[PDB]
Symmetry: C5
Subunit: 249 residues, 5 copies
């Protein structure tokens, strides 16, 4: 990497499971109380990480360096609809707000996000279309160094199976907050005044290999509680605006 | 709206009223009672049940005697002081609100809330997202045209200017982070049945409107745009019915004269 | 008032005040509490009793005139140290409060709270806003005159000076952000049934009262005004009835002499 | 009164201590707990037992003797934290089950975390929930209180001059005095409040005022004060007791020249 | 003692020691008991989470000593708590499983010697099981501060988290950071980022110095309670990653 502008943007859709053509942005209803010895969750019940590869102007070595990102979760006010489908809070009361466990995560890199597998239950039998830890053992419930993967397929890597790998990701920046619990309030902020700098302490940002920029996200907002009492994950899309400059390699 | 050398500062003050629905003449600042449990396939919210974005265009003094000149002057918005007005009104637990228990006081306003403002030199630009794309919205509202299942996530068709007061339902629209190059917007959504409202007042806080290059919103055709949504939470009537409560937002915006090409 | 330089000399006075709260004080024993809260009055017949309504506290601190000939000198407020007094009194869970469960301790004070202070060179300027414009307020209260539905959002008619102690109900009035050019105010409202009180004491915290140009509130008529509201939450009696509980607020204000033009 | 910091050999010292909590200690085995809490006493007949009332902790630390013809020790920094926060992860002993087949109920609810460093005893102001409370022998509480003692009564001034005597519910640090002390307290009230406690040997509180002057130690004595009521322990029966923990202090001091 | 500075990186994933009640429930404790009288409180080994520790040997440089300058650390697998289909009690009829929630402790340390610990007990009369190292000759004063209870974190899976805390009166040659959050319904809140570095230099710019060419990492990451369908509860813990930058420092003999 030697010394030494353009902007790209993306709306990245969430991958919550989409149990039918009308329920884009939701998961299938949650099952409960499967014994660890017989836990076979359906594909459409499992939120997955989102990713997109963004092609950049080819340059000939000059490389695009990501310098800043602006990002926010899109449609947060949609949760002020308490008239459609949600269980009443009490008799004559309005609908129950989306609430409970949530995960808000994004990454910007010059290559796919590197992940480490960890499982609640190693004996989980994951469905076709999902990519999950291979040859899991009891150690897969703590740290098992076999479970390395690239975030190289959209709507494939279940959020519950994978985390950003802090032992890799030399050429990406990632940020995530997990908040667990049945009554957790969603707290989401919007502003066009907030920028994250992507430069390390030596002043270098993600360098885009094969003229490619990779954005990654997961934005599980909480659980939607139907009138029947059934629960579904709700997700929202994440906007990215990335400022890049030419750097000489 | 009070609108008061080359270093001339104009201060624009205004109190923007909330638009929560106002279901009768006595419940200004409240919505109609919330319905619940409408199947997605038959969800027809009443007009007066839907809080909408508040907005106003504030005309500014004309700056340019000669419209033919190489350079023109524009009002540039440099700072805003803002706060929500009448937050103490929620200490009235004697009127209309369900008792917390037998012999107890009234239930405080609480639950999901949204506190949002914008200051720009053109209308706020908005992106539509829906809980439920099959929602049938009522006459008087402006809501995403020809929504699809993709409207429940991101559908780039749904672009609008916040160009009408009490028309754009908060539940359908967010500020568009892909536009608004000539506006600053700030919002926080806090969801949940029991969320406590937390609101601060002080005449000592100022938000700077200058971007990275030190440039504020530039007021196009001498027009300053203020936008707000202040849903404080849900009021619970003795019956158990719930209504949105909103409050007005004050703005004090300082502007200077910028030369442009 | 044209503001000139700070008058330096061999002479920064400090003044201090403990400002008692005005929660309603329903009898001789219940100083610091309101009357039991009523519930479920229809908006059309809402007549709260005076002793049920917390009011803004205010005191005027008199200062010596500085002018040998009626250029002049005014006292300028530079800083304030302030804190809520007796926060630990809520650790009394043996007196009066409803058991949390059988064989358990008393229920803590909790729920909606408001913590507000101001320091000005003149009375606090307030703006009226009502939950219910049809509320019939009791003798001894000063509340918005000729309210309309618009009084439930913003009605610019409702301007008042905080010119009387224990008269302006907290539920009717907020500091006016469109006035108070000669005062600094700070408030946080936290609403809800089960809100925990969170209160900090420290003698290391100073609020600077100086504006953008380094100018504090000026005591135009040789008076300093301190204003407060400290509703800590609701006390729940064994019976189920609820009362507001308030606590006094301490102020210590650093003053200097400021030159101004006649 | 205050001149230059004196440097030289032996112009700096550090002192440390662990101050035990004073939660009431209802028997020889329940050190660090209170007696079970009563409830619903009428204000007119409120007679709390001594062992039910947590009190402020205080200790005097002697410093190397300095000469008066003035040189004084100046407190510059304090490192402090609450000791034994992980003991609350014992959910097997004595605590009511959260539900059938469940673990014990964690300690939770109203808490107060307070410390002070001064060159004289902490100065306190009295405020009462109920001015008619009848406090027990062995406690020092607001003397001859009135209805005003429920808000602010300026008669209630005391020095924190006795360990395990000044009940926390009766007294606060007096912000109108303590010219020669720094204090820091947080009260969080409510039945379900979670304890939140941080430990780290990398956090330092600076005790210097805006002029760069720390507490000055009169007669070569340093005074530490604390209250760390962590919350309520719920027994199997439903009875509740306060739980407190010790507090560590590490105080760095330097010599300061002063003119009497 | 400590003179001029003369760079190497080491990394570790340290497993949690939550009790591991059977070969399938690695990362969990045995179900919690409740309501033992203080006079008859005999917790099983597998029910007690313990501090984790690893010693990392470094090249023998001989004085010159290895000096720990920075640490990046992260709890690993926080998203696994989004599995609400495996084994958790339903929140209500037709509902999803109950999240892990309740009392949690998140702690780490980097030192040039074993972590120095201080013993404090909920109940001094607690009778601890074989394989655990707990306060010796405890008294009622062991429920507050009893200075007898000093120990080195010198063994992995032995020192129960409920018995021991880092000693603020020692650990001159280590840096430690911990937060305890107690309560029935406390929400786990965990952040991941590869952009966060902790500086380990003291006031004089000296990091921990690796006595006998050993670096010591210590942790406890009790995430909260898992509630089984039956109502029984188990602690859940997760591994902690460490990446430590070290430099050579000249010292006097
Ligand atoms: Cl794998
Ligand atoms: Cl549209
Ligand atoms: Cl009026
Ligand atoms: Cl006294
Ligand atoms: Cl020991």
């Amino acid at each position: 990497v030697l010394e030494v502008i353009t902007e790209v943007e993306c709306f990245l859709n969430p991958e919550m499971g989409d149990p039918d053509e009308n329920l884009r942005g939701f998961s299938l209803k949650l099952s409960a109380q499967n014994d660890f010895s017989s836990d076979s969750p359906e594909r459409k019940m499992l939120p997955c990480y989102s990713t997109a590869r963004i092609p950049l102007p080819n340059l000939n070595l000059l490389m695009w360096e990501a310098v800043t990102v602006q990002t926010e979760v899109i449609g947060i006010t949609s949760m002020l609809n308490l008239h459609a489908g949600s269980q009443k809070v009490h008799e004559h009361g309005g609908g129950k707000p989306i609430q409970g466990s949530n995960f808000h995560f994004f990454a910007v890199g010059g290559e796919p996000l590197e992940m480490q597998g960890v499982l609640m239950n190693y004996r989980s039998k994951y469905p076709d279309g999902t990519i999950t830890p291979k040859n899991p053992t009891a150690q897969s419930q703590v740290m098992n160094t076999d479970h390395k993967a690239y975030l190289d397929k959209n709507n494939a890597y279940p959020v519950e199976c994978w985390v950003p790998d802090p032992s890799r990701n030399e050429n990406a920046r990632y940020f995530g907050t997990f908040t667990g619990g049945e009554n957790v309030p969603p707290v989401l902020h919007v502003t066009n005044t907030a920028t994250t700098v992507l430069l390390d302490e030596q002043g270098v940002g993600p360098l885009c290999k094969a003229d490619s920029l990779y954005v990654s996200a997961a934005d599980i907002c909480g659980l939607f509680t139907n009138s029947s009492g059934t629960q579904q994950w709700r997700g929202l899309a994440r906007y990215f605006k990335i400022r890049l400059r030419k750097r000489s390699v």
